Amino acid sequence: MNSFLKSILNTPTLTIRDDVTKLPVWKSLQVKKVEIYSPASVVSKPLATKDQTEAQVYTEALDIDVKNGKIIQPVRLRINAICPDLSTVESIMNAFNDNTSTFAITSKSILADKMAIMTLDVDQSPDMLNAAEINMEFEQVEPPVLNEFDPAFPQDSPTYGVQIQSLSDANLLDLGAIGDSISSAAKS
Amino acid sequence: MKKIPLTAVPNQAISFNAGSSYWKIRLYQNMDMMNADISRDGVIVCHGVRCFGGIPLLQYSRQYRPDYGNFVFDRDADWTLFGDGINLFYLDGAEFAEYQALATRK
Amino acid sequence: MKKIPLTAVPNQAISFNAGSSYWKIRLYQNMDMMNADISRDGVIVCHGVRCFGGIPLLQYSRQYRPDYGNFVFDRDADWTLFGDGINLFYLDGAEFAEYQALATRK
Amino acid sequence: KRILRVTFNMPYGPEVIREDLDVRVRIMKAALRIQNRATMEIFGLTTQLRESLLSQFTAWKHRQRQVGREDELMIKVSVEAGYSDQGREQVSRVFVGEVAIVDIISPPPDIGIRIQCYTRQIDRTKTIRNMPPANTTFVKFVEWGANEMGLNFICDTSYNDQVLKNPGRSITVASAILASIQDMYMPDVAAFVDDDILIVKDRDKVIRPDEVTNVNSFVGIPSWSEWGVEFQCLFEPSIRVAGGVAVESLMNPSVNGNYVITALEYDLASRDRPFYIKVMGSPAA
Amino acid sequence: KRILRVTFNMPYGPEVIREDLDVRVRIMKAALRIQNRATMEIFGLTTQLRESLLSQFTAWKHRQRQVGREDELMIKVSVEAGYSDQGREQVSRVFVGEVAIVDIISPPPDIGIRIQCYTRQIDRTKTIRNMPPANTTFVKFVEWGANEMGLNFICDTSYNDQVLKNPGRSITVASAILASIQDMYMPDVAAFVDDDILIVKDRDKVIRPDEVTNVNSFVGIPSWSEWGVEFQCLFEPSIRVAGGVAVESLMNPSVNGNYVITALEYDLASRDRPFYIKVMGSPAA
Amino acid sequence: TLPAYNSDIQQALKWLHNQAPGITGLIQRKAQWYDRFSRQFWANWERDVF
Amino acid sequence: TLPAYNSDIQQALKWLHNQAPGITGLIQRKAQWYDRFSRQFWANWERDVF
Amino acid sequence: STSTIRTGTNNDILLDDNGNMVILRDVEACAQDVRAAMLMRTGENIFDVNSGVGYFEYIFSPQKSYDDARKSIADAILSSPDVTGIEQLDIDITGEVFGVDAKVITIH
Amino acid sequence: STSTIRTGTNNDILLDDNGNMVILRDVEACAQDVRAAMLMRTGENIFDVNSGVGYFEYIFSPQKSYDDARKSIADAILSSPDVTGIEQLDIDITGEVFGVDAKVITIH
Amino acid sequence: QLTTAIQDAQNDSATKILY
Amino acid sequence: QLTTAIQDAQNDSATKILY
Amino acid sequence: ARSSVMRNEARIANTINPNVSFGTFLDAICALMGIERGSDLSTFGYGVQVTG
Amino acid sequence: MLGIFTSLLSSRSFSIVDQNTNQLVAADLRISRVNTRFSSVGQRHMLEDGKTKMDSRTIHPMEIIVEVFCPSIDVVDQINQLLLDRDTLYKVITRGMVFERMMCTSEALNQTPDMISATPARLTFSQVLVQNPKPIMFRNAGDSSMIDRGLALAEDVVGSAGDLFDYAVN
Amino acid sequence: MLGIFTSLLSSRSFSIVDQNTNQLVAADLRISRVNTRFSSVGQRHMLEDGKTKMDSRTIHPMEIIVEVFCPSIDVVDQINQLLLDRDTL
Amino acid sequence: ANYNYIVDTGVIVADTADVLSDVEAEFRAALGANINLAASTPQGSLVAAEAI
Amino acid sequence: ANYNYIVDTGVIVADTADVLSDVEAEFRAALGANINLAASTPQGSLVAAEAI
């Protein structure tokens, strides 16, 4: 039953990373069940069809209509696990309370990313005096669209327009232009 | 003397109503320097103005009378220290004339 | 000089407001060529016009006169390559007159 | 097995939207000046059909451009609804008018449009071609208005032989003709336009006395009103506005009698429960 | 992380209501004479904050008393909304106006006020201090109106060099100036006030041609309309009223093109789903 | 333009009318006449045009 | 300003073209020409300005 | 309808007998593109940076679980045009060989 | 990007060899700040009052549980800028020693 | 509905003649 | 909400009562 | 049939206009002025030395 | 069910054939149960006297719920690709019962200590309703019906007629 | 859970300490189970192309459900005034 | 294609996203309407070189 | 492939252009020695674009 003899390319090791720091968070979080639900939404009303056209000129029209009529809802995870330490629970609670939190849950072979905690249930019962059961839920904040993007570089970055509205006057030890001139001539 | 908010990004474009005019400066990192594209009231005033500390942006009189103002960097432009350390200030006609008078006798 | 948006389908009809007029061109594969039916402002200007590269669609004077414009195919018409490779361009009166003046000494 | 069709009129031709697509038409008509309305929620539109319809429906080409001398300025659409069983049909006509509003109600994955059509939205007419009569009778002013609007007229009233001085020389467009005819003599005789027929009649009289509609089955109960009897019914392709009705109720025995129709509220949904018409009726003389 | 602030202006100072409190701001702006509206529901108010705000918001002291010569008569409140991630902010301004109405929608245990503000609710101004021009051009009447209201102006129209005999000496208060500028020449050139800038321009022209906003991501589908294209989007702090837009859609390929903005519907809820802006746009010339 | 044009008249004639003397006879006769009075006619008329 | 600018022309040479003649040859010669006609040109033109 | 300049095993532009450039189209082009995209180390595109295979972060390193290597190879394969999906991806490991095998299901 | 004047174990300002003040930044600055914040008794900041470790109300008292002490130490550690969380807060007792060990996960 | 009533109210105020 | 529209169709009242 | 003829007649309707004619019809029209479409032949080398 | 004598000792029960390209998809899933539930709605209308007319009936789209076991990671990836596939309609053949125009509405993987090697999954497809289930097409590419593009607002190019002439000359 | 010593064989697990006056209350409840469920809500936003941006997250208030045994009427009244005590946390 | 980045009001330089898109479109029009300009391909390498 | 320097009479640096031969000579001897650089071919189009 040697559970350390895990598979090589289907390793049953849950690894919740952190998209900011790329480090494993909440180790020693013995996991008992993982459920990955990925929904979608199809057309409900009957689609129209314009027949009396040719072979394959109907095909791309139908393909575009089908590409146009189904909307994807991103993934939710439900991890049921057993926390042995108070440090892990405090970290989980603080991460949940933090408004901004994106993690990358890697299940047996699933690599779902940009994932945020939705609900967290901590059950303390007389049959588990030490440790406590955790039922945590996750929702994908953003599907993994590939940012083609203009990288590697401070420069070559796309121009983003910050439309400022009202301009503040000034502060510090400044007397109009003479203050500005002294500050500039300070060479600092 | 009005301080223009900045954001620590390499390339950006800021449009605002200052001094009875609609200014728009696009600041971008060009190699090891910074340049600015300045457009007033839609019509573009100048391109590729290399940015320095204390040195006026609109360098030519045609671009700043009658009392149109000017933009001045306290230090040499560096988008890494934008917001915290390097500020850009706008001067109306009178304040910029006084700045010219002070800076032309140094 | 305005290209007309086309779709890679064998037989289609596109209507648009170009050159202060309401044009409508129906392009269809006839045997092994393309034919076009052109209707301006409701009335039908011509039926079964062969589509050729460079040759104007509205051939006779009574149609493209006066300054109404004309339509030109860059290459011989082919609905398989419509939108990518073969385009139809619309010329107003002056542009089509200059096209005629160039094309009559060829 | 409801059968509902929305038939547009476009340069290519009529593209009939059948009942297979989810359609919902709320028509509201009345014996008033105001143009009768029809809101149309149509889902299941393809990209090509949306391009062919919504791009043509526009409020431009008469404001920032010229492109207008006659019809084809705005698309005229008719509605043909009814029942069908054993192979027979019952498709009547319930609305004719031009679209005026177009929006989208339901976003993806069901891109559904909602248009708003009004009867006689061709107030984009020719600013009154023929001058109105100087001194003439009421029936004659009605005939002139009908001829100007291009509609056949049914004028049945006791006020026809009454002369008017300057009957509508301030009229600015064709639609205002109906407003003027409604403005003069408004205690009873209210004129309106039902589809293609301009009706000028007293409010207590039936347009076609031989066309009384005996009504015995109702949805709900035929109830009273401060004017007459009001009741909802399943779609019968024989009930128009201003028509005569011969209500014979069971639940309410005091509402039995002959009534003329003043209002009409069609609510037809091929893929939904509401397929009713609501009738406001007043005592008929 | 959405970041939404409601910043009042009271004698004590600005009291910024942050996004931690449940705030819901529905702003509706348009290119009309009408004052743009903002309805903001704020829950979680303490007793002290309620007494500090609602007591100042009142319609008295100018009807049954005097206490009035300038501003401080009614509280001017601005709205600053945007996004924030990685430490960088995007808080732009989406509304500036004075409160007019105070109520509570939600009773205890969540005592949440609902207050109604309109832009330029200082209409009880100094009853026109400087007399309007006797005979002048449209641009100069617009300049006089902007100077009287105290707002900077953007006048870009082809009707500027048209003399008016006698432009608006029936005006009673400062607000009616905008109604007058709207009244004259009103097929296209409609004047409005966006925040503190009075814009007078043709309806088919953009205030800032260099400031087109390329839009590629929408919520739902960019659909056709009577005039142009209508579409909803997530909050982008670069879309104003009457600005230029460069719609590039995927679901609908025919709506691609350049559009000017006519109407804007902000719906920002820090603690609820709706954080969208809806744009009405018309073809740009 | 490119992807052929069919127009054979005999395309109507399924596998079913494989041993049929009649439907096949009618279609063959009609195809022969349409050929003789359209294709042959236009070929001779173009020979005239030349 | 500060955080480098590379702009090396030869940055467009992936690990795939490690033993390639062609792609590597073309990119190297293109880089040599852009060097000779931009960097050398501006160097000797600044020497001119001096 | 993907098209690509035909190259040899040295990843260099290999010409035909007449000294022209062959433009492979559809199936062969897609196969060549997938092979080329799987040989690109991550962080090499100064115009994508995040693209490429993790030959030094997930492969060639004492990585605990090779699911990340599988995901990177799958992403690299899917990034090529007209690929749609992968029918099978084997990550077999010999003594010192990281044997990988793909069964791309390209549309054409 | 925290920065703090360098201090010694005696907890005064300790200068360098040149006679200057060193401004530690990021990791060392955060470590010094956390150590300083864990040595501050509650009620010592007249401008925060409630801040600081409960060294007399939660530790050093004949108390029933030390979970309040754990909460106080965690709050004191987290109050420092650029701390985010605590990976481990081991709390061991010897006869008298109230041993506390932290595993702060400062980002920078 | 509010929106349909609003649109109907807007309709009957659009004739060719501006004034 | 028609209540907000009702509250909006009340703003047309300046200091002039004129009266 | 009844469609083959329709396409044929629309194909050869305005064939006498040389700016819109095609094929052998255009060849006929342009042969009046002496402009004659040539023939597509091939190089016909003879006497090539073969060593074996 | 009966209906068909295969007389074949290797018949396949479940098939998800991609309608375009006519290819098997996820040819390895271990199916365990299929429920193809239909649906339709009545329009009960009470009317005056105690009675109720149903009026017509609407044929709501059919749904299929398939319980499967995925024994391979490539199969899991294929199923995820099916869920993310918005541009192809599949055809599901359970047991002599063919359903075309099927698109995956939902999918739920389950990883439990009861199954360490494989993963149970619950696919759910829904049918895409069309106006005409049986379309009419034409063989040769000449004879379409015509589709109209509506108003186009012809875009702008800058080439003058000289470049167009040179293009036609070449 | 682990993370803290006691070296003390008399630690009581559960405690309801009144915030003001910092005193224990209902010091005689026989706790049997505690369930501390967190909550938060997403802002799913479908957008044009098949995709749904989750936007931000709102942290709903924590809830705790405690099953207990009250062994005495005094404890029952203490819980009743706990529920009726509207002015202390 | 390259517009005129010299103009008269000083040099107007565009972002590398824009110039890369311009070179990409020019390569696409020259070589083939559906050539893959992936950075790992030879054509993509040439495009990146002409973008730097 | 040269920068003519009018030393004292025109004071202006003049481009020489004629870089098509140079770019053809690079495609040759680097990508090969026998490439058919004739137009209407992919390499010819690439060379023409690069010379432009």
mmCIF file of N, CA, C and O in Angstrom, chain N residues 29-77:
data_model
loop_
_atom_site.group_PDB
_atom_site.id
_atom_site.type_symbol
_atom_site.label_atom_id
_atom_site.label_comp_id
_atom_site.label_asym_id
_atom_site.label_seq_id
_atom_site.Cartn_x
_atom_site.Cartn_y
_atom_site.Cartn_z
ATOM 1 N N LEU N 29 -21.143 25.397 29.399
ATOM 2 C CA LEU N 29 -21.691 24.702 28.245
ATOM 3 C C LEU N 29 -20.856 23.471 27.936
ATOM 4 O O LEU N 29 -19.623 23.522 27.968
ATOM 5 N N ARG N 30 -21.522 22.359 27.628
ATOM 6 C CA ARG N 30 -20.820 21.142 27.236
ATOM 7 C C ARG N 30 -20.805 21.111 25.713
ATOM 8 O O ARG N 30 -21.735 20.623 25.077
ATOM 9 N N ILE N 31 -19.745 21.664 25.124
ATOM 10 C CA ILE N 31 -19.655 21.736 23.672
ATOM 11 C C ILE N 31 -19.545 20.332 23.096
ATOM 12 O O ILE N 31 -18.891 19.452 23.663
ATOM 13 N N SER N 32 -20.184 20.118 21.964
ATOM 14 C CA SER N 32 -20.166 18.848 21.258
ATOM 15 C C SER N 32 -19.681 18.988 19.826
ATOM 16 O O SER N 32 -19.046 18.066 19.316
ATOM 17 N N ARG N 33 -19.963 20.109 19.162
ATOM 18 C CA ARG N 33 -19.336 20.301 17.858
ATOM 19 C C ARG N 33 -19.284 21.788 17.539
ATOM 20 O O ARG N 33 -20.166 22.548 17.939
ATOM 21 N N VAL N 34 -18.237 22.195 16.820
ATOM 22 C CA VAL N 34 -18.093 23.564 16.340
ATOM 23 C C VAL N 34 -17.810 23.524 14.845
ATOM 24 O O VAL N 34 -16.994 22.722 14.380
ATOM 25 N N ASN N 35 -18.490 24.387 14.092
ATOM 26 C CA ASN N 35 -18.361 24.439 12.639
ATOM 27 C C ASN N 35 -18.259 25.900 12.224
ATOM 28 O O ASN N 35 -19.257 26.623 12.270
ATOM 29 N N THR N 36 -17.072 26.335 11.815
ATOM 30 C CA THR N 36 -16.811 27.738 11.492
ATOM 31 C C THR N 36 -16.706 27.877 9.976
ATOM 32 O O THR N 36 -15.627 27.741 9.400
ATOM 33 N N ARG N 37 -17.834 28.175 9.337
ATOM 34 C CA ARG N 37 -17.897 28.267 7.886
ATOM 35 C C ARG N 37 -17.650 29.703 7.437
ATOM 36 O O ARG N 37 -18.333 30.637 7.884
ATOM 37 N N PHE N 38 -16.655 29.872 6.570
ATOM 38 C CA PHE N 38 -16.397 31.146 5.926
ATOM 39 C C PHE N 38 -17.330 31.305 4.727
ATOM 40 O O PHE N 38 -18.084 30.399 4.369
ATOM 41 N N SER N 39 -17.269 32.463 4.073
ATOM 42 C CA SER N 39 -18.044 32.647 2.853
ATOM 43 C C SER N 39 -17.508 33.842 2.080
ATOM 44 O O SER N 39 -17.015 34.811 2.659
ATOM 45 N N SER N 40 -17.634 33.758 0.758
ATOM 46 C CA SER N 40 -17.288 34.829 -0.167
ATOM 47 C C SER N 40 -17.966 34.520 -1.494
ATOM 48 O O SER N 40 -18.315 33.370 -1.773
ATOM 49 N N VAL N 41 -18.152 35.558 -2.307
ATOM 50 C CA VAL N 41 -18.953 35.477 -3.523
ATOM 51 C C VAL N 41 -18.138 36.015 -4.690
ATOM 52 O O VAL N 41 -17.415 37.006 -4.542
ATOM 53 N N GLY N 42 -18.247 35.349 -5.849
ATOM 54 C CA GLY N 42 -17.586 35.807 -7.052
ATOM 55 C C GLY N 42 -18.474 36.682 -7.920
ATOM 56 O O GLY N 42 -19.677 36.803 -7.708
ATOM 57 N N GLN N 43 -17.850 37.289 -8.927
ATOM 58 C CA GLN N 43 -18.489 38.251 -9.822
ATOM 59 C C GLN N 43 -18.305 37.824 -11.270
ATOM 60 O O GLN N 43 -17.791 38.561 -12.113
ATOM 61 N N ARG N 44 -18.719 36.574 -11.513
ATOM 62 C CA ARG N 44 -18.585 35.975 -12.864
ATOM 63 C C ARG N 44 -19.096 36.955 -13.912
ATOM 64 O O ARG N 44 -20.206 37.482 -13.744
ATOM 65 N N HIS N 45 -18.321 37.135 -14.971
ATOM 66 C CA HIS N 45 -18.662 38.097 -16.014
ATOM 67 C C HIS N 45 -18.329 37.492 -17.368
ATOM 68 O O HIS N 45 -17.173 37.547 -17.799
ATOM 69 N N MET N 46 -19.321 36.911 -18.037
ATOM 70 C CA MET N 46 -19.102 36.460 -19.401
ATOM 71 C C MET N 46 -18.812 37.671 -20.276
ATOM 72 O O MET N 46 -19.286 38.779 -20.011
ATOM 73 N N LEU N 47 -17.996 37.476 -21.307
ATOM 74 C CA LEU N 47 -17.589 38.631 -22.099
ATOM 75 C C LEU N 47 -17.310 38.199 -23.537
ATOM 76 O O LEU N 47 -16.262 37.622 -23.829
ATOM 77 N N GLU N 48 -18.264 38.483 -24.423
ATOM 78 C CA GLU N 48 -18.051 38.376 -25.862
ATOM 79 C C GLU N 48 -17.564 36.985 -26.247
ATOM 80 O O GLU N 48 -18.363 36.056 -26.403
ATOM 81 N N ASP N 49 -16.250 36.840 -26.403
ATOM 82 C CA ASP N 49 -15.645 35.542 -26.668
ATOM 83 C C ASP N 49 -15.884 34.587 -25.505
ATOM 84 O O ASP N 49 -16.037 35.004 -24.354
ATOM 85 N N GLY N 50 -15.934 33.290 -25.811
ATOM 86 C CA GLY N 50 -16.247 32.322 -24.780
ATOM 87 C C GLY N 50 -15.254 32.387 -23.645
ATOM 88 O O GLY N 50 -14.135 31.873 -23.744
ATOM 89 N N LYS N 51 -15.686 33.002 -22.546
ATOM 90 C CA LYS N 51 -14.787 33.399 -21.474
ATOM 91 C C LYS N 51 -15.579 34.085 -20.368
ATOM 92 O O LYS N 51 -16.626 34.682 -20.639
ATOM 93 N N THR N 52 -15.096 34.034 -19.127
ATOM 94 C CA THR N 52 -15.811 34.640 -18.002
ATOM 95 C C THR N 52 -14.805 35.166 -16.981
ATOM 96 O O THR N 52 -14.204 34.389 -16.234
ATOM 97 N N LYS N 53 -14.642 36.488 -16.943
ATOM 98 C CA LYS N 53 -13.753 37.137 -15.987
ATOM 99 C C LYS N 53 -14.425 37.214 -14.620
ATOM 100 O O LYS N 53 -15.544 37.712 -14.497
ATOM 101 N N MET N 54 -13.741 36.716 -13.591
ATOM 102 C CA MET N 54 -14.325 36.647 -12.255
ATOM 103 C C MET N 54 -14.326 37.983 -11.528
ATOM 104 O O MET N 54 -15.039 38.120 -10.529
ATOM 105 N N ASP N 55 -13.562 38.964 -12.002
ATOM 106 C CA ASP N 55 -13.499 40.308 -11.407
ATOM 107 C C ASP N 55 -12.936 40.163 -9.992
ATOM 108 O O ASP N 55 -11.907 39.491 -9.821
ATOM 109 N N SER N 56 -13.552 40.756 -8.971
ATOM 110 C CA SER N 56 -13.017 40.768 -7.618
ATOM 111 C C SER N 56 -13.834 39.844 -6.717
ATOM 112 O O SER N 56 -14.716 39.110 -7.175
ATOM 113 N N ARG N 57 -13.526 39.870 -5.421
ATOM 114 C CA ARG N 57 -14.182 39.012 -4.443
ATOM 115 C C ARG N 57 -14.615 39.825 -3.233
ATOM 116 O O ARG N 57 -13.866 40.683 -2.758
ATOM 117 N N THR N 58 -15.817 39.546 -2.734
ATOM 118 C CA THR N 58 -16.327 40.156 -1.514
ATOM 119 C C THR N 58 -16.358 39.112 -0.407
ATOM 120 O O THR N 58 -16.873 38.009 -0.604
ATOM 121 N N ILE N 59 -15.816 39.468 0.753
ATOM 122 C CA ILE N 59 -15.699 38.544 1.874
ATOM 123 C C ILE N 59 -16.955 38.665 2.728
ATOM 124 O O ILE N 59 -17.118 39.631 3.477
ATOM 125 N N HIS N 60 -17.842 37.683 2.617
ATOM 126 C CA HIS N 60 -19.031 37.644 3.445
ATOM 127 C C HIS N 60 -18.661 37.309 4.887
ATOM 128 O O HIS N 60 -17.617 36.708 5.146
ATOM 129 N N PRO N 61 -19.500 37.697 5.846
ATOM 130 C CA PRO N 61 -19.158 37.467 7.252
ATOM 131 C C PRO N 61 -19.075 35.990 7.600
ATOM 132 O O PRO N 61 -19.808 35.150 7.072
ATOM 133 N N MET N 62 -18.158 35.693 8.513
ATOM 134 C CA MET N 62 -17.984 34.357 9.060
ATOM 135 C C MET N 62 -19.231 33.924 9.817
ATOM 136 O O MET N 62 -19.927 34.745 10.419
ATOM 137 N N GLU N 63 -19.522 32.623 9.786
ATOM 138 C CA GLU N 63 -20.589 32.067 10.606
ATOM 139 C C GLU N 63 -20.043 30.887 11.390
ATOM 140 O O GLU N 63 -19.207 30.139 10.886
ATOM 141 N N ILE N 64 -20.485 30.747 12.634
ATOM 142 C CA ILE N 64 -20.114 29.620 13.481
ATOM 143 C C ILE N 64 -21.386 28.947 13.964
ATOM 144 O O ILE N 64 -22.309 29.621 14.429
ATOM 145 N N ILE N 65 -21.436 27.626 13.852
ATOM 146 C CA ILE N 65 -22.539 26.832 14.374
ATOM 147 C C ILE N 65 -21.971 25.907 15.437
ATOM 148 O O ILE N 65 -21.078 25.102 15.155
ATOM 149 N N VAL N 66 -22.483 26.026 16.656
ATOM 150 C CA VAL N 66 -22.009 25.264 17.800
ATOM 151 C C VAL N 66 -23.161 24.416 18.316
ATOM 152 O O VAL N 66 -24.214 24.950 18.678
ATOM 153 N N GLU N 67 -22.963 23.104 18.362
ATOM 154 C CA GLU N 67 -23.873 22.224 19.082
ATOM 155 C C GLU N 67 -23.320 22.010 20.479
ATOM 156 O O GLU N 67 -22.139 21.675 20.637
ATOM 157 N N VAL N 68 -24.177 22.226 21.484
ATOM 158 C CA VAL N 68 -23.812 22.189 22.891
ATOM 159 C C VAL N 68 -24.890 21.442 23.659
ATOM 160 O O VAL N 68 -25.997 21.218 23.169
ATOM 161 N N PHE N 69 -24.554 21.075 24.892
ATOM 162 C CA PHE N 69 -25.517 20.615 25.881
ATOM 163 C C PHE N 69 -25.521 21.608 27.033
ATOM 164 O O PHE N 69 -24.459 21.938 27.578
ATOM 165 N N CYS N 70 -26.706 22.112 27.371
ATOM 166 C CA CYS N 70 -26.883 22.941 28.550
ATOM 167 C C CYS N 70 -27.261 22.048 29.718
ATOM 168 O O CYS N 70 -28.323 21.407 29.674
ATOM 169 N N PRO N 71 -26.431 21.953 30.760
ATOM 170 C CA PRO N 71 -26.767 21.110 31.908
ATOM 171 C C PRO N 71 -27.569 21.802 32.995
ATOM 172 O O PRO N 71 -27.958 21.129 33.959
ATOM 173 N N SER N 72 -27.829 23.103 32.886
ATOM 174 C CA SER N 72 -28.501 23.804 33.970
ATOM 175 C C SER N 72 -29.351 24.946 33.431
ATOM 176 O O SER N 72 -29.067 25.536 32.381
ATOM 177 N N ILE N 73 -30.392 25.266 34.201
ATOM 178 C CA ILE N 73 -31.306 26.343 33.847
ATOM 179 C C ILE N 73 -30.579 27.675 33.835
ATOM 180 O O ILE N 73 -30.899 28.558 33.031
ATOM 181 N N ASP N 74 -29.608 27.856 34.730
ATOM 182 C CA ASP N 74 -28.819 29.081 34.723
ATOM 183 C C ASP N 74 -28.066 29.233 33.410
ATOM 184 O O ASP N 74 -27.999 30.331 32.847
ATOM 185 N N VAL N 75 -27.509 28.135 32.896
ATOM 186 C CA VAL N 75 -26.831 28.176 31.604
ATOM 187 C C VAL N 75 -27.823 28.475 30.487
ATOM 188 O O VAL N 75 -27.517 29.218 29.545
ATOM 189 N N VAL N 76 -29.024 27.896 30.568
ATOM 190 C CA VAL N 76 -30.031 28.163 29.542
ATOM 191 C C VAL N 76 -30.394 29.644 29.521
ATOM 192 O O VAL N 76 -30.489 30.263 28.454
ATOM 193 N N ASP N 77 -30.588 30.239 30.699
ATOM 194 C CA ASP N 77 -30.881 31.668 30.762
ATOM 195 C C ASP N 77 -29.691 32.497 30.299
ATOM 196 O O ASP N 77 -29.868 33.574 29.717
#
